[PDB]
Design brief:
Four copies of one chain form a homotetramer. Chain A has 18 helices and 13 strands. By secondary structure, chain A is an alpha/beta fold. Chain A folds into two domains: about 240 residues, TIM Barrel; about 140 residues, Pyruvate Kinase, Chain: A, domain 1 (3-Layer(aba) Sandwich), CATH 3.40.1380. In chain A, helix 11 links the parallel strand 7 and strand 8. The longest helix of chain A has 19 residues. Chain A starts with 11 loop residues before the first helix and ends with a strand. Strand 13 of chain C pairs antiparallel with strand 13 of chain D, so a sheet runs across the interface. The complex binds ligand I9C, 1,6-di-O-phosphono-beta-D-fructofuranose (FBP) (4 copies), oxalate ion (OXL) (4 copies), potassium ion (4 copies) and magnesium ion (4 copies). The site of one magnesium ion has 4 residues of chain D, from helix 9. It is classed as transferase/transferase inhibitor.
């Protein structure tokens, strides 16, 4: 079986609780997190985190997405930062146990319409192959359409994460989310635009609505602010990181903590440590039931397979859900049900591998082997790639159970199969 | 469509509380799904005619009960043959053929402590005549079940033993009896004499609840439509009783004198069929599925893990059916324990398993007769297609429906591990 | 276990093995069913009232005394049979048997008298019904079971036929056809309660659908806080046989589990060979079924569904029921003029008996329509100080409770009273320790 | 509607989060008490008057700093600023005085001296530092002597042993303080939130006050506005179920002590309206054990009645504060207005969330029933003056059958004016 020690780790006594109150009462500081950290860390790259050597330390500390703030620097400066990130990422393309795809996100300066500088900076993003755009001061659905249009003919695969920074953005949230790929709760400007004591209501509301819609939500700004000058954060700061994860955030961000502060690597390490602890403390019993009850009935086989797979993973305490995905959509639909099992996404798309870091609990594996002549053989080779990487990284052991999600024919949009596999 | 959400008590099924669920029950909401609670009809003078048995199979009879408290071995062998003859008269159309189980109900131990000598003889008769199930009378402890198992010998290992709880000791030792039995029968006639009559409903509801929790079949028996022995229509208490046995969670409902000796055997089967369909639509699945899920323990068995994943997927898309390939019936039983609204269409080559799965609510057995294909994957698809074709013929499926298909990774029993979402074309 | 540990040490483990208390503490309905125990005996008094149809088998004063002792709470007179002279003799015999026990509170049982109308037959109120309803007013009947109610205007016609003198009579509309089921909400709004008349309903709609109509109407009446009666063929075989069938005992238990305030006996008591035994059987089943009710979910659902209220009687009633559940109160003693304060307690389905102390003989008979209400008729002349008249009535309920099994030394009771005399001013809840 | 009522009616916690509205303004009075540490920046009588008006309910004196002479001057200045508002008895705000001990280090003689100072100066609460076991609480209780029988002991959990022995400490303490500063050094900083949420949950279950403390608005020591993490932290302590929130250096030595109190007040009001009462009340009620105590039985009946009619307040007559504490444990949305003649109980009841103490200084009526009705009308008049009540509102009134402590057993539904 698994043993009594297995059921004492990763807050499993608190997870089995019949009420939220009992769940809180059963939280144990001695119950150690075992699962890999599922909340992605976005680190803002600036003078303090630009060097190739510093970026290697940040990748090792847990950075998944590199943010380039186009409110500062120049095109030449950000292109050098992008090249340094790509160089530090590719320095691990040898050791499979260390290679990790890192997304590149462009944060716009902001706006009567889209600013001239935004148009130029967005074009720069397309030309430099950025994966994500954090669009500043989004107030309505037409602002997202303008950013979408500026991403031109070559950039329609770039993800647009709309930053909600003012009262109008909060009030028009539903129409913005409908046309955006995700949302960033941009607390800095939001805390100036609306009373500071109301920001938590906007954060909790937007995270809840994004979780319900199955779209990524980023919690941003001043999460570990004091770490710009101090080697350890305050009690309010560690609490804030933990509570953003407990709220349901897919990503957490570092701004000045990594862009200009004295402790960029330590700030990433701190976010990693807190997120792991907070993910184990999530009350999955009620969360899954509520995501289940609130999500409408679906006749989309990818959505139907995803809920079946997450239910199966919870039933056997599956070590992982291995999904084959071209666009990342199959992994995103698994992620919306918040499984405790890691979602190992095997893809041939280098861009999808970087973009799936926006989805909580998705661990991308970029597959570069040449295709098999028989499609079913090519599928099994990718499933075994996910198992062998999982074994290598520590996610899996022989005798573990995994859930495998695939489709019935090649190409995106046909996911409809869930298999229960025993690791051999 | 908007009309779809009007039928099969779907407004009452979406209710957030049990009280609102009751308030939304609609007499104009027609049941659409196939009747999932099995009907056991006791065979007798009123129901041994081969032509009368054909009418009863068409009316909904799933299990033929042979009461060994009456008649000789020669009488019961003629009952078995008349049953098999009426069942096999429909084998010429394999897409509409209905398997019918044969159950032997023992006389019991009487003033005796354990397996009576007559029961030893009757049980061996059952093995020799290939009965599918034994309804073991007056089971009081786990050792009574072991004695019935021993009397069936090495050749009767596949026969299902349903322990009849008919007295206080059986109720008090219920847990140990259920652990070693394949299922339970709430034998209300003797139970109502052995314990105060006003307490039988507590024993019925408790045993049904515990069997549902254990995932084992439970039969509600005796006097369900008693007045239909002489009258063409039942009383208000009788229709209520049938509906409430289904709402309690019974897998099977039974007819005794109503089919064995009465004047309305076909109409008593039609009546149970009509009530069960209405009551199944009125089940509050929202709470029931949540509770069965929360109470079911964690499992490392791939059949069990696939079953809950498949039931969850079926609810998510309002799947018309869950088509499962099964050798012993176990994969269909594990689907059935989560009480899906979707019909569990079980495709099997075992004629015995096809008969025995009638004990599990919502399992519709299809007997596959074709010899195996050389390529195993093609043999699985042909059986899946046979389920789709049978389901289309029988009204379970239409083009455009979504179905969940449950299969395994290699031949033989015990390897179910795959769930597929399929669109009917 | 932690929420019942101190109370288990105080009241004892035997207290918590009775009245299905292990099944009542269950966290799910499934676990609640699994914990039902045939050895867990009912302790509480029977709360679902029994309506017995009075006919040739149950008319004698001596037979009626046996039926009152067996548990009959409401005597039904079916105006589809007999004559005015026949039913007046039945009424007089019921009143004579009821008053033969008027010697003390520790032995008095008030019994309501209900008139069941013949019906309209082939649209408006029939001329026979106008005559029969006038008979009911003249003979002081407490309730009218109005046959074949199809719309709100049918109820208004019955109310009009009762005249100015029959304003206090309760109108229980009988739902017997498809139109009455479809127009249920408008009928319930203007009626005092409902009767699920399963005999005609089972002929008017498919017999296999009657259970849906019964469960729906009971649920809606529970939600509205109005009495609902389950009627017809509950113990049918007991007309000739001394014991009922397994379906019949199941039906009675399920009507109580559904949420019915009253259960009825028709030919079972009017013409059968075992009228007293039929009443005893319904009494035995109802007590067992009341203990098996899953109060944990039921109370939560009645609370969540009941709208917010600014009526102090309504606010006091929910507070009193909550307090009674918290301490396992033996009773909730309420002072009432019309029965309304006791009815508002009853709508939350407390496990504690609602002992209603009233001076109104009619209200004492009519509160039998509400599940768990035990009426006590107070006969003493008023005290000079109103506060001391209130205290005397509360003590009358505590004295009847003490020597009637209900209350014991060391028991907690919840007492519900008002701030001024007259109907409509209930607003006080007190926790009292009995000594 | 206002006070997050659309989010409060939600059928799931997820839908409740989705319905939270920045435009839905808080209407109810702030229920989470603010403890402000008094030091050089908040010592002056004039500064203390502005802090009382900003929302300070409990004045904390940290015996890790200063001297007995210094803290006695602080106590006198607090009492002077509090009494400057006693001319209007319908608006007078009681303020508790809490002594925070230095601690044991490697019961110390320093602590024995400081605890006797507290008894001699009439302190209402002792924040007992570094509590590791039930015997540490007994030692603090012994040092308070026979004259300090009524002082509330709030045990500070600041290390691994305190967390592990939490249950035995809570059973003998009056309440708990989650002392996050030392706890964040004694255990990994990323685990403190688990200890905070667990201790708050267990105290809510036990019906005992819990204080969230340290670095809640830390940046406000030098800056006029807090960080986004800080406002989030205050809101989350209230959402966790904390009865009190604390300010240390923010009020003791910082440049913006009044602004820090105003900030905690503003956040707490917003966070209290965002509490999901539908699930919280049902969980507190299901988990609270069955009781034969009439005060306990009346308290749940009164909270249930208050929710049923959206009562503006629950007015309770209490001697020791116990009847108000038993109402508070069910977390009613209605303000618990506690009318008390004891000045000590009025100060100590600030430890319980949603309890608003009213000190009774009117002459006693000759008839006891008349005396009770006047204390009840006093609650109504103070409520009307302070904005808690309006004509037409419904209030729940909780009283006893006989004078003296321990006889609460009555709940009445009253319509205002
Ligand atoms: C002042 O902080 C901000 O307004 C927050 N924005 S940021 O965290 O993305 C951030 C980016 C940057 C720098 C600092 C910095 O905090 C910076 O000093 C800097 C300096 C020179 C070039 C680029 C940057 C840059 O991108
Ligand atoms: O998540 P996405 O983008 O829909 O990709 C899922 C697709 O990947 C697969 O599993 C395998 O497809 P490929 O063989 O083309 O990689 C498909 O069967 C399925 O439709
Ligand atoms: O329910 P059972 O008896 O375990 O049978 C399920 C088995 O049926 C199958 O689906 C088909 O197997 P066969 O080809 O041997 O019939 C197996 O893959 C699976 O293990
Ligand atoms: O239930 P009802 O009909 O509203 O009667 C309750 C009334 O009974 C009382 O408790 C006592 O009133 P009386 O003295 O008129 O009998 C009132 O204070 C209260 O208004
Ligand atoms: O809350 P406590 O400490 O039990 O005190 C509440 C007490 O207050 C009262 O309401 C009034 O008491 P006093 O007359 O002593 O002021 C009592 O009836 C009740 O017992
Ligand atoms: O731009 C941002 O990140 C903000 O304003 O918080
Ligand atoms: O054997 C039976 O069917 C019974 O006793 O009810
Ligand atoms: O009228 C009735 O009582 C009936 O139809 O059942
Ligand atoms: O002593 C304290 O208050 C702390 O350590 O947080
Ligand atoms: K920017
Ligand atoms: K038999
Ligand atoms: K009639
Ligand atoms: K200190
Ligand atoms: Mg900004
Ligand atoms: Mg029998
Ligand atoms: Mg009729
Ligand atoms: Mg400290």
């Amino acid at each position: 079986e698994l043993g009594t020690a297995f059921f004492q780790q990763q807050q499993l006594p608190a997870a089995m609780a019949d009420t939220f109150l009992e769940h809180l009462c059963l939280l144990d500081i001695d119950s150690e997190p075992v699962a890999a950290r599922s909340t992605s860390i976005i680190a803002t790259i600036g003078p303090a985190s630009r060097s190739v050597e510093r970026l290697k330390e940040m990748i090792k500390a847990g950075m998944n997405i590199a943010r380039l703030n186009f409110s500062h620097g120049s095109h030449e400066y950000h292109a050098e930062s992008i090249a340094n990130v790509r160089e530090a990422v590719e320095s691990f393309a040898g050791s499979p146990l260390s290679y990790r795809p890192v997304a590149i996100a462009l944060d716009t300066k902001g706006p009567p319409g889209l600013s001239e500088q935004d148009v130029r900076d967005l074009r720069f993003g397309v030309e430099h192959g950025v994966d994500i755009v954090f669009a500043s001061f989004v107030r309505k659905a037409s602002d997202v359409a303008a950013v979408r249009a500026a991403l031109g003919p070559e950039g329609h695969g770039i993800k647009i994460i709309s930053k909600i920074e003012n009262h109008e953005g909060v009030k028009r949230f539903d129409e913005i989310l409908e046309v955006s790929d995700g949302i960033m709760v941009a607390r800095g400007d939001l805390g100036i635009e609306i009373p500071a004591e109301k920001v938590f209501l906007a954060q909790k509301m937007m995270i809840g609505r994004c979780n319900l819609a199955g779209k990524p939500v980023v919690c941003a700004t001043q999460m570990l602010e004091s770490m710009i000058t101090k080697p350890r954060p305050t009690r309010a700061e560690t609490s804030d990181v933990a509570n953003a994860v407990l709220d349901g955030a897919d990503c957490i961000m570092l701004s000045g903590e990594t862009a200009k502060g004295n402790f960029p690597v330590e700030a990433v390490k701190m976010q990693h440590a807190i997120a792991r602890e907070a993910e184990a403390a999530v009350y999955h019993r009620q969360l899954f039931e509520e995501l289940r009850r609130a999500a409408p009935l679906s006749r989309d086989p990818t959505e139907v397979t995803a809920i079946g797979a997450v239910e199966a993973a919870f039933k056997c305490c599956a070590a992982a859900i291995i999904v084959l995905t071209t666009t990342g959509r199959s992994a995103q639909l698994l992620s919306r049900y918040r499984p405790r099992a890691a979602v190992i996404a095997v893809t041939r798309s280098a861009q999808a591998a970087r973009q799936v870091h926006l989805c909580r609990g998705v661990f991308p594996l970029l597959y570069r082997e040449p295709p098999e002549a028989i499609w079913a053989d090519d599928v099994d080779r990718r499933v075994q790639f996910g198992i062998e990487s999982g074994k290598l990284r520590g996610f899996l052991r022989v005798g573990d159970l995994v859930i495998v999600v695939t489709g019935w024919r090649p190409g995106s949009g046909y996911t409809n199969i869930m298999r229960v596999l025993s690791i051999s």
